[PDB]
Amino acid sequence: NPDPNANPNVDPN
Amino acid sequence: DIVMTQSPDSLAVSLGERATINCKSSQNILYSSNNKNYLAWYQQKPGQPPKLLFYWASTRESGVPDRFSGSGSGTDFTLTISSLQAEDVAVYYCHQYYSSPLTFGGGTKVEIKRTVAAPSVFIFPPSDEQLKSGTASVVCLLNNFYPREAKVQWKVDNALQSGNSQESVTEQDSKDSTYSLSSTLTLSKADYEKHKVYACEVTHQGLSSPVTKSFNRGE
Amino acid sequence: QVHLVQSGAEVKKPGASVKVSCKASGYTFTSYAIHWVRQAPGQRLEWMGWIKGGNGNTRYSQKFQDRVTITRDTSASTAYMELSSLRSEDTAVYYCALLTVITKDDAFDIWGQGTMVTVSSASTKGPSVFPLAPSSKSTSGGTAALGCLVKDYFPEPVTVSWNSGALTSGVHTFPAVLQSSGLYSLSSVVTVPSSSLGTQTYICNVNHKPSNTKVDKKVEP
């Protein structure tokens, strides 16, 4: 599953 | 470390032709919970920072013409330029933001195959300012030509020179898809004054015979 | 317009340290993270790390963890990257970027212009700008070619504009060459109308930020 802190400017939603 | 592998590394097609760029992710970068691939595509022209084209693999950024599309999922992705135009000569990068560290493909250079343009040749005598510093640089200019392959030889008093010139070629022009070349012969002011004829000889498949542009040190 | 303006290119001796800066505008600086990315010679792009412009939390690549510190200044809206104990292999262009801002609100991606860092113990030297004047040897078909020759500078790079940027059509700024003296030399050239050489003025603007030298040179027939 993807790590959401690799780029915190991405909201996965 | 998710490696991103781009294929090809270099592709050249004629104006209007379709270019396809493939990118392999070393790990599956689709997330089945939100049904998103975490991939972007960038475009980079020499001397400039990269320029986003696609996010979530297929989502176009504002400004990007519709001849560009993005597709793919899982481990296999694709950038397509349906009709290559001159403005698209650049280097293209895939890029993933699935996991840390953020990583980037190797790059794919995109060239355009165009018709034969013979160079315009110009020669530039040294300036008096430079001759006050005690050196003399002669500049041969090869403007707007295709293909990039071009030969330049320096002649001083009709003797082929060896080992005192340097030269570079530009990237491909984003208007007419041509290349330009500048060569520089440099000599001490003492050696410059010992000679009369300074000439440059250009070879190119748009020329049926070598072209020489010359000047005499006087004028 | 969102702009990331990045401090000038720099020459540094090995072992020393470099603090490159990234000035934000055009967006709420405290809401997004500033990433730093290295483009090393011919090699690919390399993510170095990010700092979050509100709470200042950083995360670093494992290639640079031990030698780089990224900091921010909420007041000046400026993020900073500091690389220390510099090696000659750190010579690269360093970028700051709001990488993939994909929020439910907005979507953008902005990079700064890059800061070229050259790490070298060689002689530094500003450019000597000599005119390439138009003559009978540089005219053709109603057009004349003229230019500037930017010789004997270290390190890269030099930026060249024409008429403070009013002249962009027909400009060709060549890649620099490396002379056997270890000094660089480039050419910037433009083709202009040959009918208006006595009414028009052509001044090339040469900018070597590694030495903070600017030279303008008027190229006259």
Give the tokens for residue C126.
Answer: 């500003």
Q: Are residues C139 and C96 in the same domain?
A: no
Write down the experimental method used for this entry: X-ray
Q: Are residues C95 and C196 in the same domain?
A: no
Q: Looking at C101, C119, C137, which one is the last position of a domain?
A: C119
Q: Looking at C119, C154, C174, which one is the last position of a domain?
A: C119
Domain B120-216 in the same topology as domain B4-113: yes
Q: Are residues C143 and C204 in the same domain?
A: yes
Decide if B3 contacts B99 (C-beta within 8 A): no
- What residues of chain A lie within 8 A of the CB of B97, using their CB? 2, 6-7, 10
Q: Are C138 and B97 inside 8 Å of each other by CB?
A: no
Q: Are C109 and B55 inside 8 Å of each other by CB?
A: yes
Least Cα distance to C189 among C125, C108, C134 occurs for C134
Tell me if chain C has a CB within 8 Å of the CB of B174: no
Task: Please identify among residues 42-61 of chain C the ones whose CB lies closer than 8 Å to any CB of chain B.
Answer: 44-47, 59, 61
- CATH homologous superfamily for the domain B4-113: Immunoglobulins (2.60.40.10)
Q: Looking at C119, C146, C172, which one is the last position of a domain?
A: C119
Rounded Cα distance, B64 and B52, in Å? 9
Rounded Cα distance, C162 and C171, in Å? 8
CATH of B120-216 given 3.40.1410.10, 3.40.1280.10, 3.30.1370.30, 2.60.40.10 = 2.60.40.10
Rounded Cα distance, B67 and C160, in Å? 33
Mutate to test the interface with A, among B2, B35, B98, B102 (most CBs of A within 10 A): B98
Q: Are residues C176 and C196 in the same domain?
A: yes
Resolution rounded to one decimal, in angstroms: 2.3
Decide if C127 contacts C210 (C-beta within 8 A): no
Give the tokens for residue B117.
Answer: 């343009």
Rounded Cα distance, B102 and B22, in Å? 19
Decide if C135 contacts C190 (C-beta within 8 A): no
Q: In what order do the strands lie in the sheet with B179-188?
A: B120-124, B135-145, B179-188, B165-169
For C88, the enclosing helix (H) or strand (E) is none
Please state the separation of Cα C44 from the chain's center in Å. 18
Domain that holds residue C186: 128-218
Q: Are B99 and A13 inside 8 Å of each other by CB?
A: no
Rounded Cα distance, B128 and A13, in Å? 66
CB count within 10 Å of CB C35 equals: 26
Q: Are residues C35 and C114 in the same domain?
A: yes
Distance from CA of A5 to the nearest CA of C (A): 9
Q: Are C103 and A9 inside 8 Å of each other by CB?
A: yes
Sequence spans of domains, chain B: 4-113, 120-216
Rounded Cα distance, C49 and C34, in Å? 8
Q: Are C103 and A8 inside 8 Å of each other by CB?
A: no
Q: Are residues C70 and C158 in the same domain?
A: no
Reduced to 3 states, what is the DSSP secondary structure of residue B164?
coil
Distances (CA, A) of B160 to B60, B135, B201, B211, C177: 54, 20, 9, 14, 21
What are the E-state strand segments in C33-138? 33-39, 45-52, 58-60, 68-73, 78-83, 92-102, 107-111, 115-119, 128-132
Based on the structure, what is the number of domains in chain C? 2
Q: Are residues C95 and C151 in the same domain?
A: no
Q: What is the DSSP letter of B18?
A: P
Q: Are residues C80 and C185 in the same domain?
A: no
Q: Are residues C74 and C21 in the same domain?
A: yes
Rounded Cα distance, B73 and B56, in Å? 10
Q: Are residues C91 and C132 in the same domain?
A: no
**Torsions phi, psi of C54, nearest 5?**
-95, -65
Rounded Cα distance, C74 and C55, in Å? 9
Q: Are residues C43 and C114 in the same domain?
A: yes
Rounded Cα distance, B75 and B30, in Å? 8
Residue C210 sits in a domain whose CATH number is: 2.60.40.10
Q: Are residues C7 and C115 in the same domain?
A: yes
